[PDB]
């Protein structure tokens, strides 16, 4: 009860927004783009459908690409720690949770089971995805499927299944090179196409020119 | 009194020589081609007599039984020679059943001890094994034999003598299963299949192959719990095939 009220006298501070976005990752030193688009992620919009013919979604999906030794994985991980549903994944392989749904007997369990993906089990939630370019071709259509209907469609086994995947999606990824250049746009510099690019809302670009400053600090912290 | 009844209209029903039929001509070919099965179209005896189809239909066995009997005693009264052969007859069904035209996946206990007619194709065969009817044993000893029907396997005399059995005496029949599973150009799309087990005994064991699409009109009945205190009330159907057909 009180904390509605102290919710809403922060609310009525001048520079509410300012803190919030300072908030968070305080472990993390600078980048405050990045922690401004998380928060514009974290919270969110508003979904519409005018009647039942035009869908438009509210979620705003981000996507990271930067040099290796950039902390992208730190965001994720205090990402993963603040949202109440986060389901966190790599595209490397042996993740301790799928990205394609499948019907087994579970080792543990031995029963006979329908094991969705991460994006189902995201539903209302977020997912995170580390190391988006190794990737295979299953994981790349169930999240092309699942970012532009919204839905994964399962037939398998005898069963024929249509769920829900409202989910909030944020990737990190690295250049093709390893190293981004300039000189060339952002579709050539990754390995990602470009109909996968177009669904993300936010794209951030993380580079590591050598600024003695920044250095020292980043050295002292 | 049903049976004798029955039977009488069996015996009726053939008699068509004066009737413009053809069943006496067909009777005549089975004994030049030393065959000992008859094809009889149900609709010709649904146009004859109503009430006759309807029982065989929804009673088989019985009936079945009741119409071997008719033919062969009118087997007898043909050429009472040529039936000195064989044991029994046997009986082919053929036409529209209508209702009773029933796929794989829409067999129900409804049909149970009735005459019904499934198309499918083959998926699983076993192979022909013999079956004993009767048994011949000889006794060294004391130069007697003793002659045993099937429908507990001797092998001492009275006196413990022991018996030798004549393998050449004994009688065996064929017998085979095969397996039915429902066309995947009908079933639907998504959907396990379903599958049926058939019987074929006689002349029909060697008929049919896997991979191959067939029609299969036969009796549809249970198999009892086998031994035991304890029964879990579930039987299993299996289907007792009178005609196969190449479609
Ligand atoms: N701004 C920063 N503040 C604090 N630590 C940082 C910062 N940038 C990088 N680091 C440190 O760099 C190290 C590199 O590991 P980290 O997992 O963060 O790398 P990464 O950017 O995910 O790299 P990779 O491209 O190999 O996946 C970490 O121990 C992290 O603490
Ligand atoms: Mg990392």
């Known amino acids: 009860d009180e904390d509605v009220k102290m919710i809403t006298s922060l609310s009525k501070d001048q520079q509410i927004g300012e803190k919030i976005f300072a908030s968070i990752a305080p472990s993390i030193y600078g980048h405050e783009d990045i922690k401004r688009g998380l928060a514009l992620a974290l919270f969110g919009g508003e979904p519409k459908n005018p009647g039942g013919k035009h869908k438009v979604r509210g979620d705003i999906n981000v996507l990271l690409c930067g040099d290796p030794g950039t902390a992208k994985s730190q965001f994720l991980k205090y990402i993963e720690k603040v949202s109440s549903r986060a389901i966190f994944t790599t595209g490397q392989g042996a993740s301790a949770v799928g990205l394609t749904a499948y019907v087994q007997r579970h080792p543990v369990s031995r029963e006979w089971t329908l094991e969705a993906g991460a994006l189902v089990l995201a539903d209302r939630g977020v997912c995170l995805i580390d190391e988006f370019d190794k990737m295979n071709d299953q994981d790349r259509t169930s999240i092309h499927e699942a970012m532009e209907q919204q839905s994964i469609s399962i037939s398998k086994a005898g069963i024929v299944t249509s769920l829900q995947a409202r989910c909030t999606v944020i990737a990190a990824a690295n250049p093709i090179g390893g190293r981004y250049d300039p000189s060339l746009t952002f579709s050539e510099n990754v390995d990602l196409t470009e109909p996968i690019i177009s669904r993300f809302d936010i794209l951030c670009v993380v580079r590591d020119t050598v600024d003695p400053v920044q250095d020292e600090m980043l050295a002292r912290f | ?247």
């Not at chain 2, 008719?70 to 009264?77: I, N, Q, Y």
């Not at chain 2, 013999?130 to 009275?158: L, N, W």
């Open chain 2, 1 to 247: 009194v049903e049976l004798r009844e029955a039977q009488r209209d069996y015996l009726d029903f053939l008699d068509d020589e004066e009737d413009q039929g053809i069943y006496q001509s067909k009777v005549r070919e089975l004994i030049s081609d030393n065959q000992y099965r008859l094809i009889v179209n149900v609709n010709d005896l649904r146009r004859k007599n109503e009430k006759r189809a309807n029982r065989l239909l929804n009673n088989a066995f019985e009936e079945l039984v009741a119409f071997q009997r008719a033919l062969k005693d009118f087997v007898a009264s043909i050429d009472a020679t040529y039936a000195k052969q064989y044991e029994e007859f046997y009986v082919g069904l053929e036409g529209s059943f209508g209702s009773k035209h029933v796929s794989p996946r829409t067999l129900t206990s409804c049909f149970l001890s009735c005459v019904v007619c499934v198309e499918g194709i083959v998926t699983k065969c076993s192979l022909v094994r013999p079956k004993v009817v009767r048994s011949v044993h000889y006794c060294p000893a004391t130069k007697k034999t003793i002659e045993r029907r099937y429908s507990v396997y001797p092998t001492k005399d009275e006196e413990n003598n022991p018996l030798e059995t004549e393998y050449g005496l004994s009688v065996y029949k064929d017998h085979q299963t095969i397996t039915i599973q429902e066309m995947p150009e009908k079933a639907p799309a998504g959907q396990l299949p379903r599958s049926v087990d058939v019987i074929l005994d006689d002349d029909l064991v060697d008929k049919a192959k896997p991979g191959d699409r067939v029609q299969v009109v036969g009796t549809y009945r249970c198999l009892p719990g086998k031994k035991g205190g304890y029964t879990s009330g579930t039987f299993r159907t299996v289907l007792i095939a009178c005609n196969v057909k190449q479609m």
